[PDB]
Nucleic acid binder design. Structure first.
Ligand SMILES: [Zn+2]
Ligand SMILES: [Zn+2]
Lengths: 111, 56, 52
DNA sequence: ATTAAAAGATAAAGTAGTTGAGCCTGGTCATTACTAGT
DNA sequence: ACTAGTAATAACTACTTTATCTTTTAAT
């Protein structure tokens, strides 16, 4: 997530400033700059497990194709819940199950 | 249901020919037979061409 | 039928422009050629080649 | 002593062939605007 | 003053080729 400009609405870029040796977000379309307090700029992970939660919506409770179980909910201890697997299409995706309750409609794993 | 990995849900015919086949088992058997027929049909032409090339 | 109607419209346009450049009056009945549509449909259905 | 010239290695891309044996049956094989006979 | 002949309106695997590269050599 990179910050955007204010008058031309363009994303900014890191740049080094020498008299105060500061990292700043700058725009080339115009002359708008701002201070950058985060050295964290580039992220590239070879193996990730982000996205296993999937796009769960409050309307997932009435899907008839999803299997139904009777697992113990953490907070409301409901006996009605559904379960599925990770949405990620990675080759090495694990088979850990994801459970969603019905009274509170929130997720919980086996951990 | 979704994410079903039981044998009966992935092409296991637990009944015999004498006892008959359930509709799901019938469809899976038909799929397997169609795959076998296609494999034989595509294999015959390649084998014939290979034999002709060897003979020549 | 869309292709055949396009062909018939092109043919009738050619006929009316020829009639105009020859300075004659058409009867609006000899310009239309039902033969192209009939023959195209019959040939396409009889042979199976879906085209002209 | 050091670098312009360039001959040549070769990396990359465009192009081209060719597909198992026989056997039987039926269907088709154009089209229409220009110019001469009576 | 009309009619009918009538002629023109496919992927898989391979080889080959080309331009690119560049390293090489003798020249600046
Ligand atoms: Zn800007
Ligand atoms: Zn719950």
């Amino acid at each position: 997530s990179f910050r955007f400009c204010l008058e031309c609405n363009n994303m900014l870029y890191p740049k080094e400033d020498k008299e105060n040796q500061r990292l700043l977000y700058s725009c080339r379309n115009c002359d708008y700059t701002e201070l950058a307090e985060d050295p964290k700029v580039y992220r590239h992970e070879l193996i990730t497990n982000i996205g296993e939660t999937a796009g769960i919506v409050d309307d997932i409770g009435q899907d008839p194709t999803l299997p139904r179980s009777d697992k113990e909910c953490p907070e409301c201890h409901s006996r009605d819940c559904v379960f599925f697997q990770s949405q990620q299409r990675r080759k090495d995706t694990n088979m850990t199950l994801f459970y969603v309750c019905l009274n509170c409609k929130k997720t919980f794993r086996d951990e | 249901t979704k994410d079903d990995f039981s044998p009966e849900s992935k092409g296991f015919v637990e009944n015999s020919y004498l006892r008959g086949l359930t509709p799901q088992e019938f469809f899976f058997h038909a799929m397997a037979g169609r795959e076998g027929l296609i494999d034989t049909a595509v294999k015959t032409a390649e084998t014939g061409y290979i034999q002709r090339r060897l003979v020549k | 039928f869309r292709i055949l109607f396009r062909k018939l419209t092109r043919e009738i346009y050619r006929y009316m422009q020829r009639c105009i450049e020859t300075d004659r009056d058409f009867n609006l009945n000899l310009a239309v050629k039902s033969t192209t549509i009939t023959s195209g449909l019959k040939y396409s259905l009889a042979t199976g080649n879906w085209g002209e």
